[PDB]
Amino acid sequence: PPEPTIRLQEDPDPEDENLYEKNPDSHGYDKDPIVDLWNMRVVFFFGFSIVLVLGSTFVAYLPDYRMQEWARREAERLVKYREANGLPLMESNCFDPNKIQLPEDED
Amino acid sequence: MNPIIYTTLIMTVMSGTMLVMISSHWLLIWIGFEMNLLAMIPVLMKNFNPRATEAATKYFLTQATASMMLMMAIIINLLYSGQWTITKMFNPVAMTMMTMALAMKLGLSPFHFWVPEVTQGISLQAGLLLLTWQKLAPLSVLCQISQSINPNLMLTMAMLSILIGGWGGLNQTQLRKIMAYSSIAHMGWMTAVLPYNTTMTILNLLIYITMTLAMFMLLIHSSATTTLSLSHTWNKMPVITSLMMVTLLSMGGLPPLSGFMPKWMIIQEMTKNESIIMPTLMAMTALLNLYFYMRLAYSSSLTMFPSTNNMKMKWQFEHTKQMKLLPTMIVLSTLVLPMTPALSSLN
Amino acid sequence: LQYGPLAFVLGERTTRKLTETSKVITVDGNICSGKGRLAREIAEKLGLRHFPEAGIHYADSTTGDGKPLDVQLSGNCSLEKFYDDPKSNDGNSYRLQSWLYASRLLQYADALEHLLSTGQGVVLERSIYSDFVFLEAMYRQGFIRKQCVEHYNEVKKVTACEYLPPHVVVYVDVPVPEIQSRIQKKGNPHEMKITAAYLQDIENAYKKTFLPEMSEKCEVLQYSAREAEDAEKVVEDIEYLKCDKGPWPDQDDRTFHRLRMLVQNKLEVLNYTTIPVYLPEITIGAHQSDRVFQKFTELPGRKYSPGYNEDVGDKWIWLK
Amino acid sequence: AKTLLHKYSDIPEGTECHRKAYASTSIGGATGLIVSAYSIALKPPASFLEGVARTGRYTFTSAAIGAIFGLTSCISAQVREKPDDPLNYFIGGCAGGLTLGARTRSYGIGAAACAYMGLTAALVKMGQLEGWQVFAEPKV
Amino acid sequence: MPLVYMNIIMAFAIALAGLLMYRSHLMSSLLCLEGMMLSLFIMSTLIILNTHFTLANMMPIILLVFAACEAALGLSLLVMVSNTYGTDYVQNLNLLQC
Amino acid sequence: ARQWQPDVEWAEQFGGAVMYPTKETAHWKPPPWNDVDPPKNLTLNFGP
Amino acid sequence: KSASSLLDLIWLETILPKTTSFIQMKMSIMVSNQKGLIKLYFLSFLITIMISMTLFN
Amino acid sequence: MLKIIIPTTMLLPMTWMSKHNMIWINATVHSLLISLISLSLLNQLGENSLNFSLTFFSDSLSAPLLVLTTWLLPLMLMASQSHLSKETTTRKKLYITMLILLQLFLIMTFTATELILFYILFEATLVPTLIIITRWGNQTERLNAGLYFLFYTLAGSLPLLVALVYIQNTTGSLNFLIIHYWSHPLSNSWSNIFMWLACIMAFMVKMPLYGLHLWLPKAHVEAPIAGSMVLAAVLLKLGGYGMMRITTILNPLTNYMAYPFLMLSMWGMIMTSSICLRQTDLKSLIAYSSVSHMALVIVAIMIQTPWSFMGATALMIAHGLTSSMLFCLANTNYERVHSRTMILARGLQTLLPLMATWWLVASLTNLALPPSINLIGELFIITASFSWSNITIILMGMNMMITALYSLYMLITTQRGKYTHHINNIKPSFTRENALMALHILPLLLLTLNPKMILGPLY
Numbered sequence A: 001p002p003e004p005t006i007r008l009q010e011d012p013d014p015e016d017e018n019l020y021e022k023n024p025d026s027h028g029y030d031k032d033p034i035v036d037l038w039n040m041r042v043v044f045f046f047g048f049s050i051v052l053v054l055g056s057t058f059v060a061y062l063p064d065y066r067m068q069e070w071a072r073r074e075a076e077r078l079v080k081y082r083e084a085n086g087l088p089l090m091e092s093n094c095f096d097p098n099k100i101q102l103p104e105d106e107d
Numbered sequence B: 001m002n003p004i005i006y007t008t009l010i011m012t013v014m015s016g017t018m019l020v021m022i023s024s025h026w027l028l029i030w031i032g033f034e035m036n037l038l039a040m041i042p043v044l045m046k047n048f049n050p051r052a053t054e055a056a057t058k059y060f061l062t063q064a065t066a067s068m069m070l071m072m073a074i075i076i077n078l079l080y081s082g083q084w085t086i087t088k089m090f091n092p093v094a095m096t097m098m099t100m101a102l103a104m105k106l107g108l109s110p111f112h113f114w115v116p117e118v119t120q121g122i123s124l125q126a127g128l129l130l131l132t133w134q135k136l137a138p139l140s141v142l143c144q145i146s147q148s149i150n151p152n153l154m155l156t157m158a159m160l161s162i163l164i165g166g167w168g169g170l171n172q173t174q175l176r177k178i179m180a181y182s183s184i185a186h187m188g189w190m191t192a193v194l195p196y197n198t199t200m201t202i203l204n205l206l207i208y209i210t211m212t213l214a215m216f217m218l219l220i221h222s223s224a225t226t227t228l229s230l231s232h233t234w235n236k237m238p239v240i241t242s243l244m245m246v247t248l249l250s251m252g253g254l255p256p257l258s259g260f261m262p263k264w265m266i267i268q269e270m271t272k273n274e275s276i277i278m279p280t281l282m283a284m285t286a287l288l289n290l291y292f293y294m295r296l297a298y299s300s301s302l303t304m305f306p307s308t309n310n311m312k313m314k315w316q317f318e319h320t321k322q323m324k325l326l327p328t329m330i331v332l333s334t335l336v337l338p339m340t341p342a343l344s345s346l347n
Numbered sequence C: 001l002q003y004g005p006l007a008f009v010l011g012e013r014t015t016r017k018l019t020e021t022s023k024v025i026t027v028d029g030n031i032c033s034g035k036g037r038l039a040r041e042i043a044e045k046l047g048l049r050h051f052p053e054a055g056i057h058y059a060d061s062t063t064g065d066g067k068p069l070d071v072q073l074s075g076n077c078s079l080e081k082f083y084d085d086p087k088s089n090d091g092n093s094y095r096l097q098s099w100l101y102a103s104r105l106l107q108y109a110d111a112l113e114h115l116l117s118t119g120q121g122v123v124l125e126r127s128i129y130s131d132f133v134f135l136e137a138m139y140r141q142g143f144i145r146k147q148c149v150e151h152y153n154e155v156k157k158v159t160a161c162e163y164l165p166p167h168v169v170v171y172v173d174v175p176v177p178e179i180q181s182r183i184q185k186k187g188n189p190h191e192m193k194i195t196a197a198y199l200q201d202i203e204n205a206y207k208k209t210f211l212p213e214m215s216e217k218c219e220v221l222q223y224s225a226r227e228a229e230d231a232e233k234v235v236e237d238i239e240y241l242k243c244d245k246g247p248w249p250d251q252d253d254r255t256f257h258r259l260r261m262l263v264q265n266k267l268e269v270l271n272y273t274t275i276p277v278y279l280p281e282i283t284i285g286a287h288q289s290d291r292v293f294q295k296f297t298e299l300p301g302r303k304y305s306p307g308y309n310e311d312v313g314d315k316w317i318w319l320k
Numbered sequence D: 001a002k003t004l005l006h007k008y009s010d011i012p013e014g015t016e017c018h019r020k021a022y023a024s025t026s027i028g029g030a031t032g033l034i035v036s037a038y039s040i041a042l043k044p045p046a047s048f049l050e051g052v053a054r055t056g057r058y059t060f061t062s063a064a065i066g067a068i069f070g071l072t073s074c075i076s077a078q079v080r081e082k083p084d085d086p087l088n089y090f091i092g093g094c095a096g097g098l099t100l101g102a103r104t105r106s107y108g109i110g111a112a113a114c115a116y117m118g119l120t121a122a123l124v125k126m127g128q129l130e131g132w133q134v135f136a137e138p139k140v
Numbered sequence E: 001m002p003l004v005y006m007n008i009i010m011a012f013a014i015a016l017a018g019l020l021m022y023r024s025h026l027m028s029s030l031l032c033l034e035g036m037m038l039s040l041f042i043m044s045t046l047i048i049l050n051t052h053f054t055l056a057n058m059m060p061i062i063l064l065v066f067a068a069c070e071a072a073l074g075l076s077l078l079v080m081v082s083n084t085y086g087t088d089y090v091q092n093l094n095l096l097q098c
Numbered sequence F: 001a002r003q004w005q006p007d008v009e010w011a012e013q014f015g016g017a018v019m020y021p022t023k024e025t026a027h028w029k030p031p032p033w034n035d036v037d038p039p040k041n042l043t044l045n046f047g048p
Numbered sequence G: 001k002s003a004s005s006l007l008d009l010i011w012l013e014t015i016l017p018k019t020t021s022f023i024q025m026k027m028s029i030m031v032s033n034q035k036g037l038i039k040l041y042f043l044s045f046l047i048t049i050m051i052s053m054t055l056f057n
Numbered sequence H: 001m002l003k004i005i006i007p008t009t010m011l012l013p014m015t016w017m018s019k020h021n022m023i024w025i026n027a028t029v030h031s032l033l034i035s036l037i038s039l040s041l042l043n044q045l046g047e048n049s050l051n052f053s054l055t056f057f058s059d060s061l062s063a064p065l066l067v068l069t070t071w072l073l074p075l076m077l078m079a080s081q082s083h084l085s086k087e088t089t090t091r092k093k094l095y096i097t098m099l100i101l102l103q104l105f106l107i108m109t110f111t112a113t114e115l116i117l118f119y120i121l122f123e124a125t126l127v128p129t130l131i132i133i134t135r136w137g138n139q140t141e142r143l144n145a146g147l148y149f150l151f152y153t154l155a156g157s158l159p160l161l162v163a164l165v166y167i168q169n170t171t172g173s174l175n176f177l178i179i180h181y182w183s184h185p186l187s188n189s190w191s192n193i194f195m196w197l198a199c200i201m202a203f204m205v206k207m208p209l210y211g212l213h214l215w216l217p218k219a220h221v222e223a224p225i226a227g228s229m230v231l232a233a234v235l236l237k238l239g240g241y242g243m244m245r246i247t248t249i250l251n252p253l254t255n256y257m258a259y260p261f262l263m264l265s266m267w268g269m270i271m272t273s274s275i276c277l278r279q280t281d282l283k284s285l286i287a288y289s290s291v292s293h294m295a296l297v298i299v300a301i302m303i304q305t306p307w308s309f310m311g312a313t314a315l316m317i318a319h320g321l322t323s324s325m326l327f328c329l330a331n332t333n334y335e336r337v338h339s340r341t342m343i344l345a346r347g348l349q350t351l352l353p354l355m356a357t358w359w360l361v362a363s364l365t366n367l368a369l370p371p372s373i374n375l376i377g378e379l380f381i382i383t384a385s386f387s388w389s390n391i392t393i394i395l396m397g398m399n400m401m402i403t404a405l406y407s408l409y410m411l412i413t414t415q416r417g418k419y420t421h422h423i424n425n426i427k428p429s430f431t432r433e434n435a436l437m438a439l440h441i442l443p444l445l446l447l448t449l450n451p452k453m454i455l456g457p458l459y
C-alpha cells in the first residue's frame, strides 16, 4: 500500500486567534485598536444614547391619537346628560329599530 | 466548416422559421419546416464525432416523421374542406394529427425522448440554438390554430411533459440533459395555457428563451459539461458561479425573480376559466425542477469543491472570446418582475 | 483586428504564408545531452525560431511580465525536491510531471500559433511527445503509482488528439555512462543523485516506444554525440528530406483555420489539464485553493484584466 | 373511451352492487392492460411467454383492485343509507388498497395504498358532488 | 369518403407502424418514411384531381421534390453512421441513453 | 474552527453516469471528457 | 422515547419528507432508465398514438 | 412609508462604497438611525389605519413588527461581526447585502396593502435566508437544512397563491380594505373547505405547526448567528401576521375547521416542552421553545377573540426578543467552546458573572415572569382559551410548568455547578457581547411599561 494516506493537499486547521493577547482593552470589535474603539463608541452612542433614550421619551409623550381621553370625556358628558334626563343609560339596540325594515314572515 | 457556409446555413434556418411565421398557406408552412430541418443538421454536426452524428440522425428521423404527419394532417383537412389557409382545422381527425406532429416538433411528451439524447450528443452552441430558436415555428403554428385544439389532449400532453421533465431532471449529472429536461418542463408549462390565452404562451416563451440563453452562455463561458467540471468554476471565476446560481434560482420560479412571472400569470389565467386542480398539480411538480436546480446551485457556488494543481496556470489567462449579450440576458432573466404589466403589449 | 472567422472570411488565409521552410522540428535527448545546443544551431541556421525547453515557470514568462511568480502560486512543485526524495510523501513527483506536461502543451500551442500566424518555422526541445518517457521511468523506479500513469494517459490522449505532429524529430543518442560523467562534470548537487537505473530507463523508453511510433508518421534522424557536433550535416539532412507521410500534406485552409482558432485562446488549450479525476498527488483542498487563489489575486497586475490595473500604471481606466 | 365512464356513472350508487363491481373490474382491467403495454414497450423483460405472463399479472391485479373497490364502496353506501357521502368512497378505496397490498404482500405498501387511494376516491366523490373540472373548457 | 382514401390512409398508417417497430436496419426506417411519402403523394394527387383544383396541381410535385431531398440527407447520415460501425443496425446507436 | 467544505468523497457522488445508481445502471460508464469515442483498402487476385 | 425519538425523529420524518423523497427517487429512476434504443421509444409512441386516436374522440 | 424604505435601499450603496475596514461601523450607525426613523410608526389611531398610499399602509399590528425588524439589523451586524473576522471584504459586503435585502423585504412585507404583493414579498424573504444558511454555515448538514427550510415552505405556499388569485376572480379585489369591508360568509362546502385549507396551511407551515415543525430545528441549528436571530425573531411572525390578516374572509368556516389545528397545537406545545427537557444541544432546545411559543400563538389566532389577538401580538414581540437573546448567548458560549453541547462547558457563572446575569435574565423572561410582556401575552391567550373552553387550562398550566422546568434546566446546566477542568480558553466576555445582551434585554423591560404599544389593533 504505497498510498500516502493523505486524501488531498489541504491547509492545516488554524487555531483560534485571541483579540486580548495582542491588544488589551480590545472591546471585541476589531483587531485594529482605533477602529475598535470608534466602533464601540458609535455603538454605545447610537444604541443606548440616541435610540434607547430619545426614542423611549418620544414614545412616552406620543399624542393621544387613540382617543382615550376624548372617549372618556364623551362618556362623561353623555352619562351626565342621560342621568339628568332619566334615560336608562346605554340602550340595548345599537341602531334605531324605526329605520330597520324587518322581513315579514306571514308563516 | 467554412464561416461563410455556417453563416449561410444559419440564415437559411432563420429564413425557414420566418417563412413558417409569415405564410398563410399550409404548403408554405410545411416548406419552411423542411428548409429549417434541412439547414439544421450541419449546425448540429459542426464538431465531427460519432456522438454528434448520432444526435443529428436521431433529430433527422424525429423531425422527418413529424413533418410527414403534419403533411398528412394538412391533406386530410384539405380533403374534408377545400381550404389551404391556416385557420380553424375543420376536421377533428386532422386536428389530432396536427397536434401530435407539432408536439414531436416541440418535444412535448410522449414525444420527449429525443430531446435529452440530441442535446447531450451535440455541443453547447448547437444545444443553445436547438433549445432556443427551434421553438418559434411550432409554437407560432399552434398559436394560430389554438382555438381548434381539443383542450383534453393538449392539457394531457402538457401535464405529462411537466411530470416527465421534473422526474427526469432529478437523475442527471450531465448539464445538457438537465437543460433538455428543463426545456421539456418549460414547454409543458407553455402549452398548458394555449387553449386559454396565447399571449401567456408567448410571454412564457420569451422568458424561457432569455433564461435559457443566459444559462447556456454561462455554461459556454465556464466550459463545463458535467457537474464536477462545473464545480471547479469557483476557483477561477466565482462571479460566474454567483450569476449562474442567481439564474438557476430564476428558472426555479422563486420570487421575486423573473421566472416567477410566467407561471404566476399562467395560473392566474387558468383560474379565470374555473380550472383549479391543474395549476396546483403543475406547481407541485415544478417543485422537482426547483429541487434539481438547487442541487446544481449547491454543487456550483454555495459550496467550494476540491480543485486541482494545474488550475493555477488557468489563473494566468483571460477569455479571448467574450459574449456581448450575456449581461443583458442575465439582467432580463433576473430583474424584470416589476415590469409585468408590459405583457399587455401582446409580446 | 484580432484573428477570427471574420479575418479568415475577408483576407486572412494561412496557406499562402507557407514557404517550404516552416517544417516544425523537435530535438530530443537524454538528461544533460547536447540537444539544446544542436536545436539552437538548427534554429539559427535554418532561420527558424528557437523555443527554450519548458520549465516550471514557462507560463509565467508569457503572462503579464516575464518575471516568474512564486513557487506555490505557480506550479507548487520543484525539481530539486524530486531529485532529493523522489519517493516523497506529498506526491511531488506526479505533480511535477503533470505541471511539466501542461507547460509543454502550452509551449506547443504557442509554437503552433507562431507558425500559423507568421509562417516562420519553430524548433523545440522535448514536446508533449517524449514527455511520457520520464513518467515511464518514474513508474518503473517506484516514484509514482499506476493511477498516476493512468491519469497521465487520459490527459495526454484528450489533449494531444487535436494537434499536428512535428515534421522532423531529431534524436541524439548518448551512452548512459557518458551521461553520468557529464552529470558529475556539471556540478549541480541535486543532479548528482540521479541513479544509473533511472537514466537507463529513460533511454530505453526512448528507443522502445518513441522511435517506432513516430517513425510511421514523422521523419526521424538518429544521431550520436560525435556526429551531432556539426550542425552543417544536420541542416543538410533536414533540407534534403521531404515530408509526405505525416498528416501535414493533408491539411488545407479550413483545417489551418480550425487549428489557428484552437492554438489561440489558451484557456481551452489547457481546458482538459484539470479534468475532475481526484488523485491525491494533485487534488487540492477547498481552503488551500481559496487561500492560494486569493493570494494570486493580490498580485500587482493580476486583480483585473491586463489593461485595467491601476497599480501597474495603466491610465484612462474609466474610458477604456 | 368514455363508454366505461357512462356505464359506471349511469348506475345509481345505492343499487346494483354487481353491475358496479363489473364496471369497476372492466375499468381496472383496461387500465392494467394499458400499463402492461407501456411496460412491455419500454422494457421487454425476457421473451413472449414472460411478457404475456406479466401482462396477465398486471391486468388481474388492476381488475382485482377495481373489483374490491367497487363492491366495498357500493356496500358501504347501501348499508349506511346515506348516499353521496365521500366516506363510503374512502372506505372502498382503502379496502382496495389493502387488497393491493395483500397481492403485493407488504404491510407498508398495503397501508400506504389504503391511505393514498382512499383519499383519491374521496376527492373524486367530492369533485363529482361539487362539479370540479379537471379539464376545463375555455370559458373566458 | 370513398374506400380508396381509407385504404391509402391505412397504407400510410401501416408504414408509420413499421417505422415505429424498429426491428433493425435504419434503412428500413428510411424506406418506411418513403412509403409514407408515396401514400401522401397519391392521396394529395387524387384529392386535387377529383375537385379540379387547377392551381393545387403545383402541390404534389413540390412535395415530391422536397421529400426526395430529405431522403438524400437521411441516406448521407446513415452512411456516416455505418462508416463508424460497418453496419446500419439500429442497436449500435446506444451510446446516448436517457 | 473552520467551516466545513466538501472533500473528495463528497465530490465522488456527483461524478457518476447518473444520480442514484441501481444494479442495472451500475455498469454505465460516464462519457469521455471530450465527446470523442475510440474508433476501435481491399485486395484482389487477378488470376489466369 | 416517544416525544423525541419515536415521533419527532422517526414517524414525522417518515410521513412527509422521507416518503416524498423515496417516491420521487423511484419515479425518477423509472422514468430516466431508458437504454437509448429507439425501438422501445418508437413502440411507445405508436401505443400513445393509438391511445390518443381511440380515447380522445 | 418611503421614508423608511429608501434609507434601507441606500444602505446597499453605502456598504459597497465603504472602506475595507469601516463597513461594520457605517452599517450599524445607519441601521440604528433607520430604526429611530421607523419608531415614528408607533403613533397609531383608534380609527382604521395609517393608509400612506395605494401600495403601503400601517397598522398597530404592523407597527411593532416593523419596529422590531428595523431594530434587529444592528444587533445582527454586531453578532455577525465576530465570526466573520477572517473573511474577505467582498464576501463580508455580500453578507451585509443579504441582511439588508432581508430587512427590506420584511419591511415591505409588513405593509403590503394587497395580498398578492404580500405573497410576493413573503416568498421573496426566502432567498436571502437560504443563501445565508447554506453559504455561511459551519456543519455539513446546512445544505440539507436549507433544502428543508425551502421545500416545506413552498409545499404550503404554492396552493395559497392559487387560492389568492381565485379570490381575485370571485371577489374582484385582493386589497385588504375592500376585503374587510366586503367580507361575506363562507358556506360550509367542500370547495370552501379546500379554499380554507389553501389559505391557512401556507401560514401554518411557517409558524410552525406541531406536525410541520421538522424544518425548524435543522434550520436554526445549522444557520449562523444572524440567521438564527432573524429566523427566531421575525421570520416566524410572518405566518401569524398572515393568519391574522387572512382569517377575516374565512368566517364562519373557521369555527369547524379550527379543531384539528387547535388540538395539534395544544398537544404539540406539551410535546415540544417535554422534548426540551431531554436535549443535548442549546440551539435545538431554543428552537423547540420557539415551536412551543408559536403553537400557543396559533391557538390564540384560531380562538379568534379580541383578547386572543392582543395576547398573540404581545407574545410574538416578546418571543422574538427573547429567542434572539437566547441564541446570542448560546453563540457567545459556542465561539469560546466550539462544541455547542450543554454538558461540555459547565459552571460558567464562576468565570463569567455578568454573562451569567444575562443568562438569568433571558431565562426569566423566557419563563414568562410577570409583569413582563411575555407573561401578558401568555395570560391573555390563557384567559381567551378558558373563555373558549374551561378544560384548556389543564394543558396550559402543564405547558407553563414544563416551560419553567426546561428554562431553569438550561440555566443551571450551563451556569451552575463546577467548571470543566480541561477547558482553559474561556476568555473574559467582550464589550460587544455585553452590549448586545443589554440592547436585547432593555427594550423588553421598557415595553412592559407601555404594553398598549404592542397589543395590536383590537386594544
Ligand SMILES: CCCCCCCCCCCCCCCCC[C@@H](O)O[C@H](CO[C@H](O)CCCCCCCCCCCCCCC)COP(=O)(O)OCC[N+](C)(C)C
Pocket: A051, A052, A055, A056, A057, A059, A060, A061, A062, H035, H039, H064, H067, H068, H071, H317, H443, H446, H447, H449, H450
Ligand atoms: C442600576 C440600578 C437602577 C439605578 C436607577 C434608579 C432609577 C429607577 C427608575 C427606573 C424604573 C423605575 C420605574 C419608574 C417609571 C416612571 C416612568 C414612567 O411613568 O413612564 C412610562 C413611559 O415609558 C414609555 O412609555 C415606554 C418606553 C417606550 C418603549 C420603546 C422602546 C425604545 C425603542 C428601541 C427599539 C424597540 C425594539 C423592540 C420593538 C418593539 C409610562 O408613562 P405613562 O404613564 O404611560 O404616560 C407618560 C406621561 N403622559 C401622560 C404625558 C403621556
Ligand SMILES: CCCCCCCCCCCCCCCCC[C@@H](O)O[C@H](CO[C@H](O)CCCCCCCCCCCCCCC)COP(=O)(O)OCC[N+](C)(C)C
Pocket: D085, D086, D087, D090, D119, D122, H188, H189, H190, H193, H210, H211, H212, H260, H261
Ligand atoms: C400531518 C401533520 C399535520 C398536517 C395538517 C393536518 C390538518 C388537516 C386536516 C383537515 C381537517 C379535516 C378535513 C375535512 C373536515 C370536515 C368535517 C368532517 O370530518 O366531518 C364529517 C365529514 O364526513 C366524513 O369525514 C367525509 C370525509 C372522509 C374522507 C377524509 C379522509 C379521512 C382521513 C384522512 C386524513 C388525511 C389528511 C392529510 C392528507 C395528506 C361530517 O360529515 P358531513 O356532514 O357529511 O360533511 C360536512 C361537510 N360538508 C357540509 C361540506 C358536506
Ligand SMILES: CCCCCCCC/C=C\CCCCCCCC(=O)O[C@H](COC(=O)CCCCCCC/C=C/CCCCCCCC)COP(=O)(O)OCCN
Pocket: B274, B275, B276, B277, B280, D119, D123, D130, D131, D132, D133, H152, H155, H156, H159, H162, H163, H166, H190, H191, H192, H194, H195, H196, H197, H198, H199, H201, H202, H205, H212
Ligand atoms: C406543508 C404542506 C401543506 C400542504 C397544503 C395543502 C392544503 C391545501 C388544500 C389542497 C390544495 C387545494 C388548492 C385549491 C385552491 C383554492 C381554490 C378553491 O378552493 O376553489 C374550489 C376548488 O377546489 C378544489 O378543486 C380542490 C381540490 C383538491 C385538488 C388537489 C388535492 C391536493 C391534496 C388533497 C388532500 C389533502 C387535504 C388536506 C391537506 C392538508 C395539508 C397537510 C372551487 O372549485 P370550482 O370548480 O371553481 O367550484 C365551482 C362549483 N362551486
Ligand SMILES: Nc1ncnc2c1ncn2[C@@H]1O[C@H](COP(=O)(O)OP(=O)(O)O)[C@@H](O)[C@H]1O
Pocket: C030, C031, C032, C033, C034, C035, C036, C053, C079, C097, C100, C126, C131, C134, C135, C191
Ligand atoms: N518530463 C520531465 N520530468 C522530470 N524532469 C524533467 C523532465 N524534462 C526535463 N526534466 C529536467 O530538466 C533538467 C534539464 O534538462 P537537460 O536537457 O538534461 O539539461 P540542459 O538544459 O543543460 O541540456 C534536467 O535535470 C531534467 O531532469
